[PDB]
Ligand binder design. Sequence first.
Ligand SMILES: COc1ccc(N2Cc3ccc(O)cc3OC2=O)cc1
Ligand SMILES: COc1ccc(N2Cc3ccc(O)cc3OC2=O)cc1
Ligand SMILES: COc1ccc(N2Cc3ccc(O)cc3OC2=O)cc1
Lengths: 114, 114, 114
Amino acid sequence: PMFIVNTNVPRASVPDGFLSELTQQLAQATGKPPQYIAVHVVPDQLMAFGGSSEPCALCSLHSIGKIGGAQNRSYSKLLCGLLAERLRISPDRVYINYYDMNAANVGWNNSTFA
Amino acid sequence: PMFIVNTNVPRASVPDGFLSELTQQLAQATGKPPQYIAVHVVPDQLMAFGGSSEPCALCSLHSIGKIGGAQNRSYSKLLCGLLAERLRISPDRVYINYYDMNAANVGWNNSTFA
Amino acid sequence: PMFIVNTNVPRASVPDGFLSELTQQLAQATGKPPQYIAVHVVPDQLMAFGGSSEPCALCSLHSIGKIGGAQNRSYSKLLCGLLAERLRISPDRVYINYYDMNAANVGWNNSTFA
Ligand SMILES: COc1ccc(N2Cc3ccc(O)cc3OC2=O)cc1
Ligand SMILES: COc1ccc(N2Cc3ccc(O)cc3OC2=O)cc1
Ligand SMILES: COc1ccc(N2Cc3ccc(O)cc3OC2=O)cc1
């Protein structure tokens, strides 16, 4: 999987361990081993959510399978929990876009997963 | 909805008011309530369009519905007009990717919109 | 097409001309005219891949058609090759997400394609 977070929280307020925490927790939640999981956090962003510039996050989670109605409901609890605790973002200021990727449309190591 | 703009124009050329203006204009264009609209502007990017580094923008608009042939033409006129007037970007150096998101694939506040 | 690379390698490590090279090589690979190819490179990112903070990249290639099984394997070879030779990123630390876009969902020049 690949998990991306864009946030207006400043870089100094992103804990140094956050990437590693996300990687480990996503491995558990998706059932995918952590060596396959990539995480990207982008702080200091110029953003607004409902017209307000209080802390917020726009995220995406891409996975080959392990995406669906029930699974996505669970991931949102996990990820809102993490963003709330580590970045102090209110969970009603978090969007997460979920993407079920076809293996043919994911490149890696000179090839694709198809 | 959520609207993201990535651009090579400098941060100082982004008007005060710009995020609020996008929020309001998108509320009106989509009919969606402004409290659920997120906007994200990323200036100072290293970009090329047609191999040229003149002002350009790469954007995305995600919505649960309100996406399609005619609506997307209307959004493009709206949003290129805004990028031209406020950021001085020529409409032929703007791409906007539209995404009709399934509600089950949009997480918010410990759940999804499904 | 549009091609986006996010990487933790420093800005100084991106060689002069890299966005021109990507534009030219993507024109040859996709058959699309270079004047319509957009490229966006984002260095100095906070990222991890498999829990390691060693050089890595997360990319996307969007195209209206010219996306599929064999074509994507060819794009991955090309692009991993360039990231390795120009940015010194190991191909096994690169993910590329491929998107076949509907023309009606791509805005440009105050309208959309068809
Ligand atoms: C070999 O096992 C695996 C395990 C996980 C994956 N990956 C890696 C991956 C990369 C990009 C992306 O958009 C989604 C994505 O999701 C997966 O399931 C790929 C192969
Ligand atoms: C008032 O109810 C609403 C209004 C708007 C929405 N949202 C929010 C939203 C978030 C992420 C995304 O990718 C798309 C998206 O589109 C919507 O329609 C959801 C519920
Ligand atoms: C010369 O005519 C052309 C050449 C290329 C395109 N484009 C531009 C483009 C923009 C955004 C995007 O997500 C995909 C995309 O793919 C294309 O094929 C469209 C028309």
